[PDB]
Amino acid sequence: MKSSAKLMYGPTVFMAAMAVIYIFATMHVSDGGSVKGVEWVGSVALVLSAGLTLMLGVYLHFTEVRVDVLPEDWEEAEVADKAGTLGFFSPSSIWPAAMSGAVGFLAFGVVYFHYWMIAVGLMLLIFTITKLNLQYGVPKEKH
Amino acid sequence: MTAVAPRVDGHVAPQRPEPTGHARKGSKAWLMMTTTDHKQLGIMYIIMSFSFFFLGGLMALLIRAELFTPGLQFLSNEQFNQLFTMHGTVMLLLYGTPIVWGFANYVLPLQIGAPDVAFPRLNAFGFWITTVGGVAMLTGFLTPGGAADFGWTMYSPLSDAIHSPGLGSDMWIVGVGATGIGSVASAINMLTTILCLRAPGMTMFRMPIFTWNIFVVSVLALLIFPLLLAAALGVLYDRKLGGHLYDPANGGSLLWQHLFWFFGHPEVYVLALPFFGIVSEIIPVFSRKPMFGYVGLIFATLSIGALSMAVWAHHMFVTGAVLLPFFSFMTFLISVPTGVKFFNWVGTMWKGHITWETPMIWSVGFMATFLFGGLTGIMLASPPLDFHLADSYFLIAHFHYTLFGTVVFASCAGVYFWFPKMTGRMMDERLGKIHFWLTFVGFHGTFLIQHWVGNMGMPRRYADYLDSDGFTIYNQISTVFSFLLGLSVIPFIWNVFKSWRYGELVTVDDPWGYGNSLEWATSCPPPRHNFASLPRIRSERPAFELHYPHMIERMRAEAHTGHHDDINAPELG
Amino acid sequence: VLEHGIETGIIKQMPNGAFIEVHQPLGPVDDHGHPIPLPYAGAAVPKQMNQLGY
Amino acid sequence: MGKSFALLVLGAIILAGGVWYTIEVGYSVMAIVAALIMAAGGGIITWGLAVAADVNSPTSHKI
Amino acid sequence: FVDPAWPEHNPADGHVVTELISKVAGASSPWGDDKEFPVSAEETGYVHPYTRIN
Amino acid sequence: APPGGVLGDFLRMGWPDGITPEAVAMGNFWSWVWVAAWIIGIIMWGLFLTAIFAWGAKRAEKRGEGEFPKQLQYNVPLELVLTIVPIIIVMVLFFFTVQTQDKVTALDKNPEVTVDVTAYQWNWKFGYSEIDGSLAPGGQDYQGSDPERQAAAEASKKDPSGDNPIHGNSKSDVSYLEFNRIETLGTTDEIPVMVLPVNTPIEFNLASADVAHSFWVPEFLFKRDAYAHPEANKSQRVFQIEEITEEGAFVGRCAEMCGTYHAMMNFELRVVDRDSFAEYISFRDSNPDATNAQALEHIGQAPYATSTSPFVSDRTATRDGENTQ
Amino acid sequence: AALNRPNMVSVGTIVFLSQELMFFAGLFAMYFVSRANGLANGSWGEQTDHLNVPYALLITVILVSSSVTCQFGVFAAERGDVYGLRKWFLVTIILGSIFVIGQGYEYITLVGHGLTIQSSVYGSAFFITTGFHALHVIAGVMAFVVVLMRIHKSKFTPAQATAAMVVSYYWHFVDVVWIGLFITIYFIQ
Ligand code: HAS
Ligand code: HAS
Ligand SMILES: CCCCCCCCCCCCCC(=O)O[C@H](COC(=O)CCCCCCCCCCC)COP(=O)(O)O
Ligand SMILES: CCCCCCCCCCCCCC(=O)O[C@H](COC(=O)CCCCCCCCCCC)COP(=O)(O)O
Ligand SMILES: CCCCCCCCCCCCC
Ligand SMILES: CCCCCCCCCCCCC
Ligand SMILES: [Ca+2]
Ligand SMILES: [Cu+2]
Ligand SMILES: [Cu+2]
Ligand SMILES: [Cu+2]
Ligand SMILES: [Mg+2]
Structure with missing residues (x-):
């Protein structure tokens, strides 16, 4: 991610430059095919659109400073250099499906605008998110 | 240096896992409910996408049948209006966006040399939320009133508590919101696997064009989908409660239009870059030539990343509320990187050895289509030309050369290409060619003359027209060829079903012969962890050098235009 | 689970580059992992490593 | 080549039938049925052409 | 105070986990990253239940 | 300046000949743009075809080739020449774009007649707001606004009972609308006809009662969205034309999704002689109880729309293609 | 050494927080558009007389x-102190649950003297922006509680430490959004 943190500056500076052009060009140019005055949707959502790229770019930049030369980031690396452990990946879980079902229940709750359905769907969602996180933590059954 | 390992006696082979023909009872039922394997998830993610394709395309036929002749033969105004709303929605958000992540879930971990995705339980949630959103959105048809009937853009104040009442319009909003969570849940872990989980020696610039495209799309989908969710939840807040945010008396119409099109065109380009990548995978393998201008492609894709954000109000030239010069010019720019990456394809095929299998046929039948689609795109990008063409029927023809271009031709190309990888079996060539020719003639027939009618004064969302308009012969031709386009899926479905359980067995880890991507260095299908062994990655084509060692010196010596004089340079320390 | 063992979430990379998942046998192994398959017993088999109090 | 020409002729006759059938049923519901007829005809013609263009440059051999 | 389960590491020129860096490429194992698997079937404390029906 | 005859006809792709100088300019621009687009397309397609007929697998077998021929990947010299060319093309195209778009979007054409277009669900309503003293009833510049009928709308701004949510104004503030004396109202079974003079600068003032509609005249080669409260939306509700050159009846359609009967709100433009139009205005001004059809008959015109017919409202009719009235 | 490398979960959470910021881009857009044409006719000034600026500062400092x-x-958590994490997370839960009650009380005391959703454009825009933030704060508090009950069952390895660090990321994002939202509503007016 040495180069990943860098390539975000491209879009960041581009969108920052376009946002400032947009604000100044929309509030001071009368075209005849529109009216004069700053547009408050293309300005806020394009200033803050550059914000996303800047955030991710800066975070990855700070992160990449304090990382050693990884084999994946090394041009002439042997396959045997990463020989070790790649951390912990969940093999299986039923909870993603359940919590999709829970968001579906809340969705229809909001559609029909039934208070009980919204309330149940909200707490049916908290439960499933909780169970997703506590999946590998459920203690050995104490008698 | 290279550190040649000692020849160990006894090493025979990996297990070479069995193809998909032989499955026992219960082997898949509960596995799919709880799976966190990106392979099976991707398979079911593509299948579901195509199911929605067939379902959403049936609506297009009903629309197209009604337009055969003047007068309302079987369909009403209300039913016709809610039939293009749901057709344009199911095809863009229930087939388009998912099919993007299906090719992402399957081959992106396989292309960078990863064992799995970063968040296996999260993309498993991304599949289940999208399907739920889809089912929720379509529940509108099961209400007496019907589904949403405002288009796929839900303009204001046509889409408020006053106008368009009924629960279908809420279902549409909520379903769109839910399917948009699946896109961001998938973009999170298509972006962090690229960063973190990569094979030894696979630098960022060793990754294929496909993964670069999904990289750019991921960062591009993170800033558009939340915005749509915010806008749609603003409308729901207006409808369900008594909010006044979207009243015409304070923007409202224009507010929504800006808010929508700001994600309207970024979602459009989330449907194009991955399929440009798919095509960028297929062309080099069938031409026995490397991807011409690899870094050129990188820069082109990166340009479309940033430029696509500054062009959103070119969708609203006739509103008389936007700065015409700003959006007109910005749109003219976004054609330049596309032109670049489009010349790169020609460069790749240039003086190559082309074998015409189904993937290459599809890919070439793509460029010819999307080219004309994009050509009539710069037409609409000029306001003097867009005044006549906006909200009209020439527009309809335009975004069917680009949508049916990318998301259909390149998607099908990807299916034929990766089928041996995904299943260990190969698709029938004759049936594939039949499918291509049907879906090609049947498409150009139904959409070419569509241009002509739009210019002579037929607007888009019209249930009916008069005989004294001249739009009779054209509608007739379009309907005939559309019914032909609808039949093209018959060979496709038969091919996929038959070849899944009876297709020819793949006995080599690279059936297409000259594959140059990390997926072609593994068994078909891969063994549950993507790799029973990992090669040395020294370029963007690690599988090619793996299979063809005798030419490793040839592909370096003549890769550049000339003045290449490093083969005679002294060694470093 | 009885044939191969509990699927632990430890995706190790072998020196050759093969990604392998660590399996925890519930029974005796023969020579080099590959646990002797335990016959079904009509009871609930553990599926996670937290069910063994790890 | 064998299958091809048969498919072309069958498609052609069906398409001609459809084109003729449209003219009677003016602007009724049956115009849709006639559209389906011509679509099937055209489909068969293109199927014949596709099989013709496959036995010319085949990519799969019979074992 | 330092948790018993915390990996035995030198608190000098080395930190096991901070805000943004770690020692693995992926999620840390919830059963201790320093735990060597697999283990003998005895340590699991799983009792294969012999059952006979009829 | 269209290129030639039949070729020029082909390049239009059914684009109407255009009855306005604005339309003529747009038509010319369109023709030339298509000339260039066709060329570029031909080149791109030509390369795609040569990829089939020239660069093949066992095409390159007669010459004892083999595989992996000339495995080039980076033509840097021909890489910075194919980026620049599209840039130049788009810049030269944008110049003409901005040049052409200035004609239509100009608001300094000194109109001699203003029409208040009012789009509602689902029809149109025209009213003659201002008319120049030349082609006026008496000679004094016609001033078409209703004293008490407009002031009643201006008074709808505040709800007498507490209801001013939208920036201290009534939710249903219908005051942006303009009510006139001479008004043509379109019924579900009578197509509204707007009568205009020839060789005269007309201005159009667009607003909507409820929802967004679109004033599209295919012969104008132009459309514009009419928005409820156009000022708040910051949309220019006014557009002008230099003149209309042709005489006759021209269709107009709503080119913006607006509820169910969207396909069924069509209007007509009847462009008539200058003097004739003046006479029309005189007749309808001195006869406020008369109807538009009677006024049209007064000047020897067809009383009803000739380029359009009303739709039959019966749902379960029209099955046999008889949808006209 | 052990060849240290980026925290995968932290990078995943930062990429999630970026998208959540664009969620509020929509809300801010809606607020600013309604503000723009509210100032036009001099109606905005009348509506912002319902704000309790001093009260909104106390909750700010609380957050x-x-x-x-x-x-x-x-x-x-970096040092493996289970009890240090346990104590401060509880105090944060308490502090963050009085913000919601405080914010909720403001709503109750605001609808009492005129300002509701169905009363003005200002009211609708105030409640959309502040309402969604309140939902996010509730979600953050629930995240804290689930982390607290996660380290009650598991053995507190670096896995639990990582979970705590990412939840802190979410909390920091939420409060930063509040900081940006308070200046917009209560200061800029
Ligand atoms: C995935 C499918 C799609 C892609 C990709 C796409 C990108 C473009 N689109 Fe689009 N689009 C429009 C035009 C363009 C242009 C200029 C590009 C660009 O991406 C085009 C890229 C350029 C090329 C692909 C050309 C490459 C070919 C060569 C050879 C390279 C060199 C060419 C040069 C230098 C040009 C010189 C050529 C000459 C003839 C001088 C316009 C109007 O300007 C509207 C709104 C209309 C309205 O007013 O409502 C619109 C909106 C849509 C909608 C919905 C519209 C709605 O109202 O709901 C869809 C479904 C869609 C499809 C797609 N669109 N588009
Ligand atoms: C990738 C995205 C898209 C594809 C693919 C697509 C395919 C077609 N479209 Fe389209 N489209 C139109 C014509 C066609 C035709 C003839 C096809 C063809 O590709 C047709 C494909 C048909 C099929 C592929 C059907 C095969 C199915 C068969 C033969 C039987 C299925 C049987 C069963 C039992 C179903 C299986 C069920 C299960 C549950 C498994 C027309 C006009 O006739 C309009 C404008 C309407 C208007 O007036 O504005 C239009 C409008 C749109 C819009 C704008 C929506 C709006 O204005 O609100 C979008 C975004 C869009 C995208 C797409 N469109 N199209
Ligand atoms: C097991 C089979 C049951 C047989 C039911 C037959 C199916 C018909 C069901 C009709 C449902 C009507 C729903 C409805 O109209 O909603 C409401 C009317 O009925 C109800 O309130 C449903 C109450 C159901 C219990 C939910 C309690 C939630 C608290 C959970 C705490 C643990 C109307 O909406 P509202 O109350 O205003 O929010
Ligand atoms: C649709 C989701 C939008 C969520 C925005 C959150 C808005 C917060 C409401 C604050 C109350 C404002 C005061 C007020 O006017 O109160 C009342 C009106 O507002 C309400 O009833 C509050 C609605 C409750 C929000 C529902 C939560 C949605 C769950 C999310 C699942 C997606 C006053 O009623 P009254 O005019 O006196 O009759
Ligand atoms: C690239 C085309 C942008 C549209 C015109 C830009 C106008 C420049 C605004 C300068 C205003 C000075 C305050
Ligand atoms: C009078 C002109 C002021 C223009 C200010 C533009 C600000 C837009 C970005 C706001 C970002 C808020 C998060
Ligand atoms: Ca009809
Ligand atoms: Cu666009
Ligand atoms: Cu209309
Ligand atoms: Cu309309
Ligand atoms: Mg429009």
Whole structure:
């Protein structure tokens, strides 16, 4: 991610430059095919659109400073250099499906605008998110 | 240096896992409910996408049948209006966006040399939320009133508590919101696997064009989908409660239009870059030539990343509320990187050895289509030309050369290409060619003359027209060829079903012969962890050098235009 | 689970580059992992490593 | 080549039938049925052409 | 105070986990990253239940 | 300046000949743009075809080739020449774009007649707001606004009972609308006809009662969205034309999704002689109880729309293609 | 050495927080558009007389305080201190649950003297922006509680430490959004 943190500056500076052009060009140019005055949707959502790229770019930049030369980031690396452990990946879980079902229940709750359905769907969602996180933590059954 | 390992006696082979023909009872039922394997998830993610394709395309036929002749033969105004709303929605958000992540879930971990995705339980949630959103959105048809009937853009104040009442319009909003969570849940872990989980020696610039495209799309989908969710939840807040945010008396119409099109065109380009990548995978393998201008492609894709954000109000030239010069010019720019990456394809095929299998046929039948689609795109990008063409029927023809271009031709190309990888079996060539020719003639027939009618004064969302308009012969031709386009899926479905359980067995880890991507260095299908062994990655084509060692010196010596004089340079320390 | 063992979430990379998942046998192994398959017993088999109090 | 020409002729006759059938049923519901007829005809013609263009440059051999 | 389960590491020129860096490429194992698997079937404390029906 | 005859006809792709100088300019621009687009397309397609007929697998077998021929990947010299060319093309195209778009979007054409277009669900309503003293009833510049009928709308701004949510104004503030004396109202079974003079600068003032509609005249080669409260939306509700050159009846359609009967709100433009139009205005001004059809008959015109017919409202009719009235 | 490398979960959470910021881009857009044409006819001034600026500062400092305590909790997780994490997370939960009650009380005292959703454009825009933030704060509090009950069952390895660090990321984002939202509503007017 040495180069990943860098390539975000491209879009960041581009969108920052376009946002400032947009604000100044929309509030001071009368075209005849529109009216004069700053547009408050293309300005806020394009200033803050550059914000996303800047955030991710800066975070990855700070992160990449304090990382050693990884084999994946090394041009002439042997396959045997990463020989070790790649951390912990969940093999299986039923909870993603359940919590999709829970968001579906809340969705229809909001559609029909039934208070009980919204309330149940909200707490049916908290439960499933909780169970997703506590999946590998459920203690050995104490008698 | 290279550190040649000692020849160990006894090493025979990996297990070479069995193809998909032989499955026992219960082997898949509960596995799919709880799976966190990106392979099976991707398979079911593509299948579901195509199911929605067939379902959403049936609506297009009903629309197209009604337009055969003047007068309302079987369909009403209300039913016709809610039939293009749901057709344009199911095809863009229930087939388009998912099919993007299906090719992402399957081959992106396989292309960078990863064992799995970063968040296996999260993309498993991304599949289940999208399907739920889809089912929720379509529940509108099961209400007496019907589904949403405002288009796929839900303009204001046509889409408020006053106008368009009924629960279908809420279902549409909520379903769109839910399917948009699946896109961001998938973009999170298509972006962090690229960063973190990569094979030894696979630098960022060793990754294929496909993964670069999904990289750019991921960062591009993170800033558009939340915005749509915010806008749609603003409308729901207006409808369900008594909010006044979207009243015409304070923007409202224009507010929504800006808010929508700001994600309207970024979602459009989330449907194009991955399929440009798919095509960028297929062309080099069938031409026995490397991807011409690899870094050129990188820069082109990166340009479309940033430029696509500054062009959103070119969708609203006739509103008389936007700065015409700003959006007109910005749109003219976004054609330049596309032109670049489009010349790169020609460069790749240039003086190559082309074998015409189904993937290459599809890919070439793509460029010819999307080219004309994009050509009539710069037409609409000029306001003097867009005044006549906006909200009209020439527009309809335009975004069917680009949508049916990318998301259909390149998607099908990807299916034929990766089928041996995904299943260990190969698709029938004759049936594939039949499918291509049907879906090609049947498409150009139904959409070419569509241009002509739009210019002579037929607007888009019209249930009916008069005989004294001249739009009779054209509608007739379009309907005939559309019914032909609808039949093209018959060979496709038969091919996929038959070849899944009876297709020819793949006995080599690279059936297409000259594959140059990390997926072609593994068994078909891969063994549950993507790799029973990992090669040395020294370029963007690690599988090619793996299979063809005798030419490793040839592909370096003549890769550049000339003045290449490093083969005679002294060694470093 | 009885044939191969509990699927632990430890995706190790072998020196050759093969990604392998660590399996925890519930029974005796023969020579080099590959646990002797335990016959079904009509009871609930553990599926996670937290069910063994790890 | 064998299958091809048969498919072309069958498609052609069906398409001609459809084109003729449209003219009677003016602007009724049956115009849709006639559209389906011509679509099937055209489909068969293109199927014949596709099989013709496959036995010319085949990519799969019979074992 | 330092948790018993915390990996035995030198608190000098080395930190096991901070805000943004770690020692693995992926999620840390919830059963201790320093735990060597697999283990003998005895340590699991799983009792294969012999059952006979009829 | 269209290129030639039949070729020029082909390049239009059914684009109407255009009855306005604005339309003529747009038509010319369109023709030339298509000339260039066709060329570029031909080149791109030509390369795609040569990829089939020239660069093949066992095409390159007669010459004892083999595989992996000339495995080039980076033509840097021909890489910075194919980026620049599209840039130049788009810049030269944008110049003409901005040049052409200035004609239509100009608001300094000194109109001699203003029409208040009012789009509602689902029809149109025209009213003659201002008319120049030349082609006026008496000679004094016609001033078409209703004293008490407009002031009643201006008074709808505040709800007498507490209801001013939208920036201290009534939710249903219908005051942006303009009510006139001479008004043509379109019924579900009578197509509204707007009568205009020839060789005269007309201005159009667009607003909507409820929802967004679109004033599209295919012969104008132009459309514009009419928005409820156009000022708040910051949309220019006014557009002008230099003149209309042709005489006759021209269709107009709503080119913006607006509820169910969207396909069924069509209007007509009847462009008539200058003097004739003046006479029309005189007749309808001195006869406020008369109807538009009677006024049209007064000047020897067809009383009803000739380029359009009303739709039959019966749902379960029209099955046999008889949808006209 | 062990060849240290980026925290995968932290990078995943930062990429999630970026998208959540664009969620509020929509809300801010809606607020600013309604503000623009509210100032036009001099109606905005009348509506912002319903704001309790002093009261909105006390809750601000409460939320900032919660953030600082949260960071203290995370400082305790790097070192494997279970109890340091446990204590500061509880104080953050308490501090963050009185913000919601405080914010909720403001709503109750605001609808009492005129300002509702169905009363003005200002009212609708005020409640959309502040309402969604309140939902996010509730979600953050629930995240804290689930982390607290996660380290009650598991053995507190670096896995639990990582979970705590990412939840802190979410909390920091939420309070930063509040900081940006308070200036917009109560200061800029
Ligand atoms: C995935 C499918 C799609 C892609 C990709 C796409 C990108 C473009 N689109 Fe689009 N689009 C429009 C035009 C363009 C242009 C200029 C590009 C660009 O991406 C085009 C890229 C350029 C090329 C692909 C050309 C490459 C070919 C060569 C050879 C390279 C060199 C060419 C040069 C230098 C040009 C010189 C050529 C000459 C003839 C001088 C316009 C109007 O300007 C509207 C709104 C209309 C309205 O007013 O409502 C619109 C909106 C849509 C909608 C919905 C519209 C709605 O109202 O709901 C869809 C479904 C869609 C499809 C797609 N669109 N588009
Ligand atoms: C990738 C995205 C898209 C594809 C693919 C697509 C395919 C077609 N479209 Fe389209 N489209 C139109 C014509 C066609 C035709 C003839 C096809 C063809 O590709 C047709 C494909 C048909 C099929 C592929 C059907 C095969 C199915 C068969 C033969 C039987 C299925 C049987 C069963 C039992 C179903 C299986 C069920 C299960 C549950 C498994 C027309 C006009 O006739 C309009 C404008 C309407 C208007 O007036 O504005 C239009 C409008 C749109 C819009 C704008 C929506 C709006 O204005 O609100 C979008 C975004 C869009 C995208 C797409 N469109 N199209
Ligand atoms: C097991 C089979 C049951 C047989 C039911 C037959 C199916 C018909 C069902 C009709 C449902 C009507 C729903 C409805 O109209 O909603 C409401 C009317 O009925 C109800 O309130 C449903 C109450 C159901 C219990 C939910 C309690 C939630 C608290 C959970 C705490 C643990 C109307 O909406 P509202 O109350 O205003 O929010
Ligand atoms: C649709 C989701 C939008 C969520 C925005 C959150 C808005 C917060 C409401 C604050 C109350 C404002 C005061 C008020 O006017 O109160 C009342 C009106 O507002 C309400 O009833 C509050 C609605 C409750 C929000 C529902 C939560 C949605 C769950 C999310 C699942 C997606 C006053 O009623 P009254 O005019 O006196 O009759
Ligand atoms: C690239 C085309 C942008 C549209 C015109 C830009 C106008 C420049 C605004 C300068 C205003 C000075 C305050
Ligand atoms: C009078 C002109 C002021 C223009 C200010 C533009 C600000 C837009 C970005 C706001 C970002 C808020 C998060
Ligand atoms: Ca009809
Ligand atoms: Cu666009
Ligand atoms: Cu209309
Ligand atoms: Cu309309
Ligand atoms: Mg429009």
